Amino acid sequence: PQITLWKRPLVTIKIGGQLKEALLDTGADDTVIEEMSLPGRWKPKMIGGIGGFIKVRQYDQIIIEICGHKAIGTVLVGPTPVNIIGRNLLTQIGCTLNF
Amino acid sequence: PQITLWKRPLVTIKIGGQLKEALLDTGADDTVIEEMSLPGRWKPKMIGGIGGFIKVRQYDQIIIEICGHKAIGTVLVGPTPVNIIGRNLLTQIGCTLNF
Ligand SMILES: CCN(CC)c1ccc2c(COC(=O)N[C@H](C(=O)N[C@@H](Cc3ccccc3)C[C@H](O)[C@H](Cc3ccccc3)NC(=O)OCc3cncs3)C(C)C)cc(=O)oc2c1
Fold it and tell me: What CATH number does domain B1-99 carry, 3.30.390.10, 3.90.1230.10, 2.40.70.10, 3.90.70.10?
């Protein structure tokens, strides 16, 4: 679906059997989720933004359903005020910007 | 134009007579630009993002041409590693997310 941006582009996601809300974020290379407990072995890694940095855990080939579109890929868990879906998964669901 | 996201969605902007590159960022409520000197009277404001906050200056009814589409609105100047075009201006240029 086309989603205009008069409001924040928040969508339903399903990950690890859990339902969450997340922001579709063309400004993000990576997908990063608030504290949740994922399965499996995690590598470490660190990421930055507008006020500074945060540390996070990294899982590969995590399945995420994003407005019902499946995607598999790298997901990051660490601390954020919002769940964020980044371009690594936006590409899989066929997400474009149009204007 | 439709812009897919296999690469970061960087576009040319023209602001204050100056040409810059900026990221189309559906994850941003506001538009925030690296150090540049905008003439006119600026109100203060502290935008938050990931890693906390940064202080910035705020100008209203700034004209920005974004890939050739004009927009007028609130622009913020303070420190960022990338110039960011937020939803306040994305709405004016008719920018949608589609998938
Ligand atoms: C090739 C280049 N190489 C070498 C230099 C690279 C490439 C990439 C990186 C990257 C890639 O990093 C990442 O893409 N990070 C994601 C991230 O934060 N993206 C953000 C872009 C950005 C903005 C500001 C400063 C720096 C980068 C925008 C996102 O849209 C953010 C997400 C967010 C939104 C709201 C709350 C928290 C986080 N929104 C944002 O910061 O909004 C701020 C507000 C706006 N208006 C009111 S506040 C993150 C969420 C996974 C990191 C790095 O340290 O070095 C790199 C180097």
Answer: 2.40.70.10
